[PDB]
Amino acid sequence: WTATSGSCKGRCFELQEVGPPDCRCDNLCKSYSSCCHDFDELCLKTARGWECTKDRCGEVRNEENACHCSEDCLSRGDCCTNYQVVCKGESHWVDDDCEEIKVPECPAGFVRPPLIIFSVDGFRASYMKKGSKVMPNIEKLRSCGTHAPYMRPVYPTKTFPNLYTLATGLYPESHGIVGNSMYDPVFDASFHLRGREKFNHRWWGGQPLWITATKQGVRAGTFFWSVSIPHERRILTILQWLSLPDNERPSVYAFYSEQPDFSGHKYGPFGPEMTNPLREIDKTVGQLMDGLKQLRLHRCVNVIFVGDHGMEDVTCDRTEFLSNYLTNVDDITLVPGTLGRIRAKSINNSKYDPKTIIAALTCKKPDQHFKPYMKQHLPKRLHYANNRRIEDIHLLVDRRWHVARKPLDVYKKCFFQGDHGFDNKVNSMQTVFVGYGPTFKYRTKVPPFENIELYNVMCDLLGLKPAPNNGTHGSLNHLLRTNTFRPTMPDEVSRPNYPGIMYLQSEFDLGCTCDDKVENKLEELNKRLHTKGSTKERHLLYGRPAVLYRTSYDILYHTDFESGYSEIFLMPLWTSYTISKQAEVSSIPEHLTNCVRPDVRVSPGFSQNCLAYKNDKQMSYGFLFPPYLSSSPEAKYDAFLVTNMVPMYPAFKRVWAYFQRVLVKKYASERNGVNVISGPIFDYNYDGLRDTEDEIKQYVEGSSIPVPTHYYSIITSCLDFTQPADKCDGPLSVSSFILPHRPDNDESCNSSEDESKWVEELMKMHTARVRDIEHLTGLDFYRKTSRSYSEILTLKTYLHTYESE
Ligand SMILES: *[C@@H]1O[C@H](CO)[C@@H](O[C@@H]2O[C@H](CO)[C@@H](O[C@@H]3O[C@H](CO[C@H]4O[C@H](CO)[C@@H](O)[C@H](O[C@H]5O[C@H](CO)[C@@H](O)[C@H](O)[C@@H]5O[C@H]5O[C@H](CO)[C@@H](O)[C@H](O)[C@@H]5O)[C@@H]4O)[C@@H](O)[C@H](O[C@H]4O[C@H](CO)[C@@H](O)[C@H](O)[C@@H]4O[C@H]4O[C@H](CO)[C@@H](O)[C@H](O)[C@@H]4O)[C@@H]3O)[C@H](O)[C@H]2NC(C)=O)[C@H](O)[C@H]1NC(C)=O
Ligand SMILES: Cc1cc(OCC2=NNC(=O)CC2)c(C(C)(C)C)cc1C#N
Numbered sequence: 001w002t003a004t005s006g007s008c009k010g011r012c013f014e015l016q017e018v019g020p021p022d023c024r025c026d027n028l029c030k031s032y033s034s035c036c037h038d039f040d041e042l043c044l045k046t047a048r049g050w051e052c053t054k055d056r057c058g059e060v061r062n063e064e065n066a067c068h069c070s071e072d073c074l075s076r077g078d079c080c081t082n083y084q085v086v087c088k089g090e091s092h093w094v095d096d097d098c099e100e101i102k103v104p105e106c107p108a109g110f111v112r113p114p115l116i117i118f119s120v121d122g123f124r125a126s127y128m129k130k131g132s133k134v135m136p137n138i139e140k141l142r143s144c145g146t147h148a149p150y151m152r153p154v155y156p157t158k159t160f161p162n163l164y165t166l167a168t169g170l171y172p173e174s175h176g177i178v179g180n181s182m183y184d185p186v187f188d189a190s191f192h193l194r195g196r197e198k199f200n201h202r203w204w205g206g207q208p209l210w211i212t213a214t215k216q217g218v219r220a221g222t223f224f225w226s227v228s229i230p231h232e233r234r235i236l237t238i239l240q241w242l243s244l245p246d247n248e249r250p251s252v253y254a255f256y257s258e259q260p261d262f263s264g265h266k267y268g269p270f271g272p273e274m275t276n277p278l279r280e281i282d283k284t285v286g287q288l289m290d291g292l293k294q295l296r297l298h299r300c301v302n303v304i305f306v307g308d309h310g311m312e313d314v315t316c317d318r319t320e321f322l323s324n325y326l327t328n329v330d331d332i333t334l335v336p337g338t339l340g341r342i343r344a345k346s347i348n349n350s351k352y353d354p355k356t357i358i359a360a361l362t363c364k365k366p367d368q369h370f371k372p373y374m375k376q377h378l379p380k381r382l383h384y385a386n387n388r389r390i391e392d393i394h395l396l397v398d399r400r401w402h403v404a405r406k407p408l409d410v411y412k413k414c415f416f417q418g419d420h421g422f423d424n425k426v427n428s429m430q431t432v433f434v435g436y437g438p439t440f441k442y443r444t445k446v447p448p449f450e451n452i453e454l455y456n457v458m459c460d461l462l463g464l465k466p467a468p469n470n471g472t473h474g475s476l477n478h479l480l481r482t483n484t485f486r487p488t489m490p491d492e493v494s495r496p497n498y499p500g501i502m503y504l505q506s507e508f509d510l511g512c513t514c515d516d517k518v519e520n521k522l523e524e525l526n527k528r529l530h531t532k533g534s535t536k537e538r539h540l541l542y543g544r545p546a547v548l549y550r551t552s553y554d555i556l557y558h559t560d561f562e563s564g565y566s567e568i569f570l571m572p573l574w575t576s577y578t579i580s581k582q583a584e585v586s587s588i589p590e591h592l593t594n595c596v597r598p599d600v601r602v603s604p605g606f607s608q609n610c611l612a613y614k615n616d617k618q619m620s621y622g623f624l625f626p627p628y629l630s631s632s633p634e635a636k637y638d639a640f641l642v643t644n645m646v647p648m649y650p651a652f653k654r655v656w657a658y659f660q661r662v663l664v665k666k667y668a669s670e671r672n673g674v675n676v677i678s679g680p681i682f683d684y685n686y687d688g689l690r691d692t693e694d695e696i697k698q699y700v701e702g703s704s705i706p707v708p709t710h711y712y713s714i715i716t717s718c719l720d721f722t723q724p725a726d727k728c729d730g731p732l733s734v735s736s737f738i739l740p741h742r743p744d745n746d747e748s749c750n751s752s753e754d755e756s757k758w759v760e761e762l763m764k765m766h767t768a769r770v771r772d773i774e775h776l777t778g779l780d781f782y783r784k785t786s787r788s789y790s791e792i793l794t795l796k797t798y799l800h801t802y803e804s805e
């Protein structure tokens, strides 16, 4: 209950919220039913529309007008954006030539370049090229400023998740906005696009930019714009705020457009009806820039033109129904559309079996347009598991499709031709970034990056210290003319031990066998050189990874590979090896099929044992350095060390063997050598972070040998592939993956066929950034290179997506 009897007289778009029930005059007042009685009359004037015409020039001020063409208007800060153009023969900003902004050119009293974030809903990355002919203002920003070919949104590629990620630098699983539609089982409450529930602050975690700014003495404009406030009024309001006195004036502003998303849904992404929404947005941008130029701020303000997600072709008829797969379909609740999330219709039901539901949705139709997943088995690159609002069962839907529970949901809710929300690697979901202003670079193209990185940059642009977030600060330094942040490497916490030969064969009782005994003096200096690190410059190209937590671990050198062997987990944390373009693949000889060999540098008590694997009927083993890529029969023996062994499900060994026997060599042939770092990952509580040993839920039966949830590899080579990986003078090229360590291959519907038809497809789905692997291992890679740290940070955030162009 309000008493909306107060006035908005002199308080239109006031910047501080006033507390109940003395009434309100700000964007949110609409949404709360709390506007003063005279809000529309005073604050949302429309009279005479939004453009000066020559006949209004010098007019006598009429305070009813939407905007002003009177002589006093620049001082009052309320001219129509085109005032100078119409009434003073000035040029539109877009018609001016691009001139480098080497320094901020700000009015007296401006302590810092303001930041304006101009966000556009559903603005697909390819619109920059495909609609360039009707967006001249946007094209000027893009070509004159800093731009990426695209920006990667977060999953799901929906509006609120991506807008709140822009604002916080956090993954949805961390900020809490995991969908445009959510059920929180603790609140027993649903968040939806319509309704008041979405306004409760309990949904919104993390620290958004406007709060970071306010806590550190920097004022912010509104970020939320009521849908009924027209765009012309949003721009005018931002420009009026910018004319405030120095002590009152915000330093950070946002504009938001519902277009082009709104039309895109109706007409599809490239429907002929889309040309006009693009024209309209461009004109808004023109308004803002003409407004800035009037206020002499057009070479002072940093402008970010950014999208939340793209748009794909999606029609009613491309709908998969769960009623076609399940008998029991009236027992579940589905969050439907371009993703699926399934939970039990009734919490009072231990007669709900996720496994039966998954099984009924797996590889059931040859052409099935969705794939079910327990959330912990989703590609780790999506970071979409660690929140109670994310249901245990998830459906990843194919681009261009929808999922629904029953047909009646689709005609008793055709309408739409476009939608979004698919996997964030999908080309159609990619969106836009341009930065323009004194702090951004001039006429510069940067590589595509993820939207989680922007919070840090926006904080830099405003001299703020970012709250803790999922960006890698320094990874986007290359966007900026002048950086206030100088990243440095994290310090190594645990130093390795370098053990020599300390144990006799007979001290081991590991239950292992190997056929390995066959009697030269100059090649027993040579083997000792290898165990000492003589080849380490070849196999460890970028320094040893730094261990960033307290543990006990040993560096082990070998002719063909180096490892960091954990005495706690009883297996390598990491194993590094270089495979040249010329290298040969060989088999595991017959006599060495079951060979495992005690490592005389490591105590029986810190070693795995073969008996455990014998007794564990589910669990087998693999090797991190592959025996198949041994440099010589003699070096091959090293690959069968117990210290190179790791626990693997037989089903997983199909994947791993194919990767080690076939794919490594292919990549070395295509990339002119590769360096490989492989290792285990433990993330039993699916938080994206390295587990402590007291969090492991599975061990090889009757042992202390922990079972990894995933296995990673980082495959690095020279960006200039005319140089071999091991003699690379310049920038690097990386691809990586985090493969789920699963006792079945149900994820891959063709897994009954030869590995050549499905393994690589699986691996591509589980593509990862180096940074993802860092979070999951507490390791820090690329410690010793010839490259700047900023560049290395960019490299560690790279994701190889395996999309077309
Ligand atoms: C991406 O970046 C983010 C941001 O940096 C990383 O997220 C951080 O992860 C940290 C480590 O996991 C985590 O630290 C914990 O903080 C607890 C304090 O929590 C409150 O205060 C802060 C600060 O202002 C606040 O941000 C928190 O935010 C959550 O609160 C609610 C959740 O209901 C949401 O509104 C909000 O979105 C956010 O939710 C998200 O995080 C929570 C966990 O915090 C998840 O469960 C949600 O699903 C969601 O993802 C809080 O409001 C603090 O209490 C913890 O301390 C315990 O654990 C340490 C471990 O070493 C231990 O030493 C202590 O003993 C302590 O133990 C006691 O508690 C245990 C656990 O409850 C208990 O079992 C023990 O027996 C003890 O009693 C912990 O330090 C930090 O909160 C988040 N920040 C955010 C915003 O999420 C994320 O890791 C990055 N991602 C990647 C992939 O790198
Ligand atoms: C630029 C920006 C705009 C935003 O809100 C815009 C908006 N206005 N009106 C609506 O009806 C839809 C959403 C937001 C949120 C988090 C407040 C949603 C964040 C960010 C960022 N960074």
Ligand SMILES: [Ca+2]
Pocket: 121, 122, 158, 159, 160, 261, 308, 309
């Ligand atoms: Ca959107």
Ligand SMILES: [Ca+2]
Pocket: 682, 683, 684, 685, 686, 687, 688, 689, 690, 691
């Ligand atoms: Ca974990």
Ligand code: NA
Pocket: 613, 614, 615, 616, 617, 618, 619, 620
């Ligand atoms: Na076994």
Ligand code: NA
Pocket: 745, 746, 747, 748, 749, 750, 751, 752
């Ligand atoms: Na399968």
Ligand SMILES: [Zn+2]
Pocket: 122, 159, 261, 262, 265, 420
């Ligand atoms: Zn939309």
